Amino acid sequence: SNLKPFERDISTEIYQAGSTPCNGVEGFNCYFPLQSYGFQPTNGVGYQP
Known part of the structure; x- marks a missing residue:
């Protein structure tokens, strides 16, 4: 479900x-909650951290 405001x-x-x-x-249609997240120098202004 979605997070309540100020709740985590x-x-x-x-x-x-x-x-x-x-x-x-972690079978078909089963996904881990966490996914990678990173940045690279070549990323554009909208993609920079």
């Missing part, structure tokens, strides 16, 4: 689509 929760539980549950693995 952090967990490593794998998000599982309702129609394609995994229940024990």
